[PDB]
Amino acid sequence: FEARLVQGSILKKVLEALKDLINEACWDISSSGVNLQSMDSSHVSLVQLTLRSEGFDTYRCDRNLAMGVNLTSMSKILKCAGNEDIITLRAEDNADTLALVFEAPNQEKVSDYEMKLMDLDVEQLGIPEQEYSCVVKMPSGEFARICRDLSHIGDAVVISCAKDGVKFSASGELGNGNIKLSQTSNVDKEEEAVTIEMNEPVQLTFALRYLNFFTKATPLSSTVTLSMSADVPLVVEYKIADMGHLKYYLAP
Protein backbone atom coordinates (compact mmCIF):
# COMPACT_ATOMS: atom_id res chain seq x y z
CA PHE A 1 0.00 0.00 0.00
CA GLU A 2 1.29 3.41 -1.07
CA ALA A 3 -0.78 6.59 -1.31
CA ARG A 4 0.64 10.01 -2.13
CA LEU A 5 -1.13 13.35 -1.78
CA VAL A 6 0.38 16.61 -3.07
CA GLN A 7 -2.05 18.63 -0.94
CA GLY A 8 -0.94 17.37 2.45
CA SER A 9 -2.93 20.02 4.30
CA ILE A 10 -6.12 18.10 3.60
CA LEU A 11 -4.81 15.04 5.42
CA LYS A 12 -3.70 17.25 8.29
CA LYS A 13 -7.13 18.87 8.27
CA VAL A 14 -8.86 15.50 8.30
CA LEU A 15 -6.93 14.21 11.30
CA GLU A 16 -7.66 17.39 13.22
CA ALA A 17 -11.31 16.81 12.41
CA LEU A 18 -11.17 13.26 13.78
CA LYS A 19 -8.53 12.83 16.47
CA ASP A 20 -10.51 14.39 19.35
CA LEU A 21 -13.80 12.63 18.59
CA ILE A 22 -12.27 9.23 17.88
CA ASN A 23 -8.86 8.39 19.32
CA GLU A 24 -8.60 4.98 17.68
CA ALA A 25 -10.02 4.00 14.30
CA CYS A 26 -9.39 1.28 11.73
CA TRP A 27 -8.56 2.33 8.19
CA ASP A 28 -9.95 0.09 5.46
CA ILE A 29 -7.72 0.39 2.39
CA SER A 30 -8.56 -0.98 -1.04
CA SER A 31 -8.02 0.04 -4.67
CA SER A 32 -11.30 1.95 -4.42
CA GLY A 33 -9.61 4.03 -1.74
CA VAL A 34 -9.60 4.64 1.99
CA ASN A 35 -12.67 4.17 4.17
CA LEU A 36 -12.36 5.04 7.84
CA GLN A 37 -15.29 4.36 10.16
CA SER A 38 -15.74 4.51 13.92
CA MET A 39 -18.06 5.39 16.79
CA ASP A 40 -17.01 7.53 19.72
CA SER A 41 -16.57 5.83 23.10
CA SER A 42 -20.12 6.72 24.14
CA HIS A 43 -21.48 5.19 20.94
CA VAL A 44 -23.73 8.21 20.38
CA SER A 45 -22.08 9.40 17.17
CA LEU A 46 -20.59 7.80 14.07
CA VAL A 47 -17.79 9.12 11.90
CA GLN A 48 -17.50 7.86 8.33
CA LEU A 49 -14.59 9.05 6.18
CA THR A 50 -14.21 8.21 2.50
CA LEU A 51 -11.24 9.08 0.29
CA ARG A 52 -11.50 7.53 -3.18
CA SER A 53 -8.28 6.47 -4.91
CA GLU A 54 -8.67 8.81 -7.89
CA GLY A 55 -8.16 11.81 -5.61
CA PHE A 56 -4.62 10.68 -4.81
CA ASP A 57 -1.83 11.52 -7.22
CA THR A 58 -0.53 7.97 -6.90
CA TYR A 59 -2.27 4.98 -5.33
CA ARG A 60 -1.19 1.34 -4.89
CA CYS A 61 -2.99 -1.39 -2.94
CA ASP A 62 -2.13 -5.03 -3.64
CA ARG A 63 -4.43 -6.52 -1.03
CA ASN A 64 -7.43 -5.18 0.88
CA LEU A 65 -5.85 -4.00 4.08
CA ALA A 66 -6.97 -3.05 7.60
CA MET A 67 -4.87 -0.77 9.79
CA GLY A 68 -5.53 -0.12 13.46
CA VAL A 69 -4.53 3.50 13.96
CA ASN A 70 -4.42 5.83 16.93
CA LEU A 71 -5.59 9.11 15.43
CA THR A 72 -4.18 11.34 18.18
CA SER A 73 -0.79 9.79 17.44
CA MET A 74 -1.25 10.26 13.71
CA SER A 75 -2.34 13.87 14.25
CA LYS A 76 0.69 14.54 16.41
CA ILE A 77 2.79 13.11 13.59
CA LEU A 78 0.97 15.20 10.96
CA LYS A 79 1.52 18.44 12.87
CA CYS A 80 5.16 17.76 12.06
CA ALA A 81 4.16 18.26 8.43
CA GLY A 82 4.19 21.69 6.83
CA ASN A 83 0.91 22.98 5.45
CA GLU A 84 2.16 22.66 1.87
CA ASP A 85 4.06 19.37 2.12
CA ILE A 86 3.54 16.39 -0.17
CA ILE A 87 2.41 13.64 2.18
CA THR A 88 2.88 9.97 1.31
CA LEU A 89 1.38 7.19 3.38
CA ARG A 90 3.11 3.84 2.94
CA ALA A 91 2.29 0.50 4.50
CA GLU A 92 3.97 -1.89 2.08
CA ASP A 93 3.64 -5.20 3.90
CA ASN A 94 1.93 -5.42 7.24
CA ALA A 95 5.06 -4.42 9.13
CA ASP A 96 2.86 -3.43 12.06
CA THR A 97 3.84 0.15 11.18
CA LEU A 98 2.47 2.98 9.07
CA ALA A 99 5.03 5.20 7.37
CA LEU A 100 4.37 8.84 6.63
CA VAL A 101 6.59 10.88 4.31
CA PHE A 102 6.40 14.65 4.28
CA GLU A 103 8.19 16.28 1.37
CA ALA A 104 9.00 19.98 1.23
CA PRO A 105 7.53 21.33 -2.03
CA ASN A 106 11.05 22.41 -3.00
CA GLN A 107 12.62 19.06 -2.13
CA GLU A 108 15.41 20.23 0.17
CA LYS A 109 13.60 18.89 3.22
CA VAL A 110 12.10 15.41 3.62
CA SER A 111 10.74 13.75 6.77
CA ASP A 112 9.66 10.18 7.36
CA TYR A 113 7.83 8.95 10.45
CA GLU A 114 6.92 5.42 11.47
CA MET A 115 3.82 4.80 13.54
CA LYS A 116 3.03 1.69 15.53
CA LEU A 117 -0.31 0.30 14.42
CA MET A 118 -2.93 -1.25 16.69
CA ASP A 119 -4.66 -4.61 16.60
CA LEU A 120 -8.35 -4.09 15.80
CA ASP A 121 -9.80 -7.41 14.61
CA VAL A 122 -13.50 -6.52 14.91
CA GLU A 123 -14.26 -4.67 11.69
CA GLN A 124 -16.39 -2.20 9.84
CA LEU A 125 -19.91 -1.51 8.70
CA GLY A 126 -20.57 1.37 6.31
CA ILE A 127 -24.20 2.28 5.71
CA PRO A 128 -24.62 5.90 4.50
CA GLU A 129 -28.06 5.08 3.09
CA GLN A 130 -31.44 6.90 3.08
CA GLU A 131 -33.69 9.55 1.59
CA TYR A 132 -34.13 12.45 4.00
CA SER A 133 -37.07 14.70 4.82
CA CYS A 134 -34.86 17.79 5.04
CA VAL A 135 -31.46 18.46 3.49
CA VAL A 136 -29.84 21.76 4.44
CA LYS A 137 -26.77 23.18 2.70
CA MET A 138 -25.08 26.11 4.45
CA PRO A 139 -21.76 27.85 5.17
CA SER A 140 -19.58 25.65 7.38
CA GLY A 141 -18.23 28.58 9.37
CA GLU A 142 -21.75 29.81 10.05
CA PHE A 143 -22.83 26.42 11.40
CA ALA A 144 -19.70 26.29 13.55
CA ARG A 145 -20.38 29.77 14.91
CA ILE A 146 -23.96 28.76 15.71
CA CYS A 147 -23.09 25.54 17.60
CA ARG A 148 -20.42 27.41 19.56
CA ASP A 149 -22.83 30.25 20.34
CA LEU A 150 -25.75 28.13 21.51
CA SER A 151 -23.35 26.11 23.65
CA HIS A 152 -23.44 29.21 25.87
CA ILE A 153 -27.22 29.04 26.21
CA GLY A 154 -27.78 25.31 26.65
CA ASP A 155 -26.32 21.88 25.97
CA ALA A 156 -28.96 20.85 23.42
CA VAL A 157 -30.07 22.41 20.15
CA VAL A 158 -33.51 22.11 18.58
CA ILE A 159 -33.32 22.23 14.80
CA SER A 160 -36.69 23.31 13.37
CA CYS A 161 -36.63 23.05 9.58
CA ALA A 162 -39.40 24.25 7.23
CA LYS A 163 -39.78 25.62 3.68
CA ASP A 164 -38.94 29.25 4.51
CA GLY A 165 -35.84 28.54 6.59
CA VAL A 166 -34.21 26.73 9.50
CA LYS A 167 -34.25 27.63 13.21
CA PHE A 168 -31.69 26.66 15.83
CA SER A 169 -32.96 26.86 19.41
CA ALA A 170 -31.38 26.48 22.84
CA SER A 171 -32.79 26.84 26.33
CA GLY A 172 -30.87 27.14 29.58
CA GLU A 173 -30.83 28.76 33.00
CA LEU A 174 -29.98 32.26 31.77
CA GLY A 175 -32.72 32.05 29.15
CA ASN A 176 -33.32 30.91 25.59
CA GLY A 177 -31.95 31.73 22.16
CA ASN A 178 -33.21 31.20 18.65
CA ILE A 179 -31.06 31.66 15.56
CA LYS A 180 -33.13 31.89 12.39
CA LEU A 181 -31.65 31.39 8.93
CA SER A 182 -33.82 32.21 5.92
CA GLN A 183 -33.19 30.46 2.60
CA THR A 184 -31.22 33.04 0.64
CA SER A 185 -32.91 34.26 -2.55
CA ASN A 186 -30.01 33.31 -4.82
CA VAL A 187 -26.97 31.06 -4.38
CA ASP A 188 -23.50 32.52 -4.97
CA LYS A 189 -20.05 33.24 -3.52
CA GLU A 190 -17.73 30.57 -2.08
CA GLU A 191 -21.08 29.89 -0.34
CA GLU A 192 -22.87 32.25 1.98
CA ALA A 193 -26.04 30.60 0.71
CA VAL A 194 -28.62 28.54 2.58
CA THR A 195 -30.45 25.88 0.57
CA ILE A 196 -33.26 23.66 1.83
CA GLU A 197 -34.33 20.54 -0.05
CA MET A 198 -37.48 19.49 1.80
CA ASN A 199 -40.08 16.74 1.48
CA GLU A 200 -41.58 17.37 4.91
CA PRO A 201 -40.77 19.81 7.75
CA VAL A 202 -38.75 18.34 10.63
CA GLN A 203 -37.78 19.24 14.20
CA LEU A 204 -35.08 17.42 16.13
CA THR A 205 -33.03 17.92 19.29
CA PHE A 206 -29.32 17.04 19.37
CA ALA A 207 -26.47 17.39 21.88
CA LEU A 208 -24.42 20.53 21.24
CA ARG A 209 -21.21 18.91 22.53
CA TYR A 210 -21.03 16.44 19.66
CA LEU A 211 -21.89 19.13 17.10
CA ASN A 212 -19.03 21.18 18.53
CA PHE A 213 -16.85 18.16 17.78
CA PHE A 214 -18.21 17.89 14.22
CA THR A 215 -17.54 21.56 13.45
CA LYS A 216 -13.84 20.77 13.68
CA ALA A 217 -14.29 19.64 10.09
CA THR A 218 -14.93 23.26 9.07
CA PRO A 219 -11.46 23.75 7.52
CA LEU A 220 -12.24 20.95 5.04
CA SER A 221 -15.22 22.58 3.34
CA SER A 222 -16.83 25.98 2.81
CA THR A 223 -20.21 24.25 3.03
CA VAL A 224 -21.80 21.75 5.36
CA THR A 225 -24.83 19.56 4.60
CA LEU A 226 -27.28 18.57 7.35
CA SER A 227 -29.54 15.65 6.42
CA MET A 228 -32.53 14.98 8.69
CA SER A 229 -35.54 12.72 8.98
CA ALA A 230 -37.52 11.89 12.12
CA ASP A 231 -36.27 8.83 14.02
CA VAL A 232 -32.99 8.73 12.09
CA PRO A 233 -29.57 10.19 13.08
CA LEU A 234 -28.60 13.61 11.69
CA VAL A 235 -25.90 13.55 9.03
CA VAL A 236 -23.44 16.45 9.14
CA GLU A 237 -21.54 16.14 5.88
CA TYR A 238 -18.40 17.93 4.66
CA LYS A 239 -17.18 17.37 1.11
CA ILE A 240 -13.45 16.73 0.85
CA ALA A 241 -12.12 18.23 -2.37
CA ASP A 242 -13.07 15.85 -5.15
CA MET A 243 -11.72 12.73 -3.47
CA GLY A 244 -14.37 12.14 -0.84
CA HIS A 245 -16.35 13.11 2.22
CA LEU A 246 -16.46 13.28 5.99
CA LYS A 247 -19.85 12.36 7.46
CA TYR A 248 -20.86 12.62 11.10
CA TYR A 249 -23.96 10.73 12.26
CA LEU A 250 -25.61 11.94 15.45
CA ALA A 251 -28.50 10.09 17.04
CA PRO A 252 -31.16 12.53 18.32
Binding site: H43, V44, I127, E129, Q130, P233, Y249, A251
Partner: peptide
Amino acid sequence: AGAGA
Protein backbone atom coordinates in the same frame (compact mmCIF):
# COMPACT_ATOMS: atom_id res chain seq x y z
CA ALA B 1 -29.17 6.46 21.91
CA GLY B 2 -26.72 4.77 19.55
CA ALA B 3 -26.22 6.04 16.01
CA GLY B 4 -26.54 2.82 14.03
CA ALA B 5 -27.38 4.70 10.83
